[PDB]
Design a protein around this ligand. Structure first.
Ligand SMILES: NC(=O)c1ccc[n+]([C@@H]2O[C@H](COP(=O)([O-])OP(=O)(O)OC[C@H]3O[C@@H](n4cnc5c(N)ncnc54)[C@H](OP(=O)(O)O)[C@@H]3O)[C@@H](O)[C@H]2O)c1
Ligand SMILES: [Zn+2]
Ligand SMILES: [Zn+2]
Length: 352
């Protein structure tokens, strides 16, 4: 009992998204009721949607990069008022007293609910951003800058911040630094963008030679080297201050750790089921660090956006309507996209 929406949704293993109508919760007293103007896609949306864990809980509505005007607000809600273009991240909830989120790192809290494939504090499966509206916690929605486009603010709610708060916690956003972005796409792309926008010497590393166009002449990278090329990578001996990782599966790390000078950082992002490996020696050569980052806290989701505003950042997004999502996903598998996708839920949703 809340108020009824509609919205596209998967149902079995092979993620074919049907239409789907469902009863929301109600916006009280710390909920924000939003009308979703545009959502967005990335590989997280397929990998939930397919299982790729053997964990997917159907009926499943994808959508964690959302942006759109707020139609209703709580009783204690104060921050936002109606009619604000507001956006919301991956997280929808979390508890309240665990000191992980006394000091604002609320993503590193055990009791976090996600946008979809979770179960909220009331019981309803959290359903995504592929539905023409939703109800979030007022603590898990960030407001939006004056001029930041609704297509442009969306990807940054998960891939834009994913990479920002590594380049913020490990020291890295004070200027100068050399960095090598490994795996140019999604999470690689915003890496190149925000690190080179911080006045850093960014090198792209790659499986292929192919993403050379969307790097040197499009992203603004200072170099491009193949991971599997020993002679060009050896020139980059103890070069970079950090190396980030968008590569999605079991790759060997000591290749990628060579490219690091004294006190360098390997910051792994991707969900890599299977243990990764290292020689305790190399790390002892240069006092080198291996760690992983998980998206961003809302204060740095607040920050990242107003940062992407000031240093005016962008990406080529192919805005598609809602009746083109499974074709957008097949294209996302043949990784065509046109550097990014945004689903503007200003299309096909009505009933059933
Ligand atoms: N905070 C987090 O922990 C976080 C945040 C967002 C997403 N993720 C997850 O991490 C993954 C990646 O991010 P994304 O979804 O935005 O898209 P994505 O990085 O564009 O996905 C593929 C990219 O990784 C590279 N790649 C693939 N296989 C590789 C290999 N074997 N060796 C080297 N490079 C390889 C490809 O570039 P090349 O062909 O040029 O090598 C390609 O650009 C996803 O599974 C996503 O769900 C984690
Ligand atoms: Zn995402
Ligand atoms: Zn907590």
């Amino acid at each position: 009992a809340e108020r009824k929406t509609t919205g596209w949704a998967a149902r079995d293993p092979s993620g074919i998204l049907s239409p789907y109508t469902y009863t929301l919760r109600e916006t009280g007293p710390e909920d924000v009721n939003i009308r979703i103007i545009c959502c967005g896609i990335c590989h997280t949306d397929l990998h939930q949607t397919k299982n790729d864990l053997g964990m997917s809980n159907y009926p499943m509505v994808p959508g964690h990069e959302v942006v759109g005007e707020v139609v209703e607000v709580g009783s204690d809600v104060s921050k936002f008022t109606v009619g604000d273009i507001v956006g919301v991240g991956c997280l929808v909830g979390c508890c309240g007293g665990c000191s992980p989120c006394e000091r604002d790192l609320e993503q590193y809290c055990p009791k976090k609910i996600w946008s979809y494939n979770d179960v909220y504090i009331n019981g309803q499966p959290t359903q995504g951003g592929f539905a023409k509206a939703t109800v979030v916690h007022q603590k898990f929605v960030v407001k939006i800058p004056e001029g930041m486009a609704v297509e442009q603010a969306a990807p940054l709610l998960c891939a834009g911040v994913t990479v920002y708060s590594p380049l913020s916690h490990f020291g890295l956003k004070q200027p100068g630094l050399r960095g090598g972005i490994l795996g140019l796409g999604g999470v690689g792309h915003m890496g190149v963008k925000i690190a080179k926008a911080m006045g850093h010497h960014v090198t792209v590393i790659s499986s292929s030679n192919k993403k050379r166009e969307e790097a040197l002449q499009d992203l603004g990278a200072d170099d491009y080297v193949i991971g599997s090329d020993q002679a060009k990578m050896s020139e980059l001996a103890d070069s970079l201050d950090y190396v980030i990782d968008t590569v999605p599966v079991h790759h060997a790390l000591e290749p990628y750790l060579s490219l690091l000078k004294l006190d360098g950082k390997l910051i792994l992002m991707g969900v890599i089921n299977n243990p990764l490996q290292f020689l305790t020696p190399l790390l002892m050569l240069g006092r080198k660090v291996i760690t992983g980052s998980f998206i961003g806290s809302m204060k740095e989701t607040e920050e990242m956006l107003e940062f992407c505003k000031e240093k005016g950042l962008s990406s080529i997004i192919e805005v598609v309507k809602m009746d083109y999502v499974n074709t957008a996903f097949e294209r996302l598998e043949k990784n065509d996209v046109r550097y990014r996708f945004v689903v503007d839920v200003e299309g096909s949703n009505l009933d059933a």
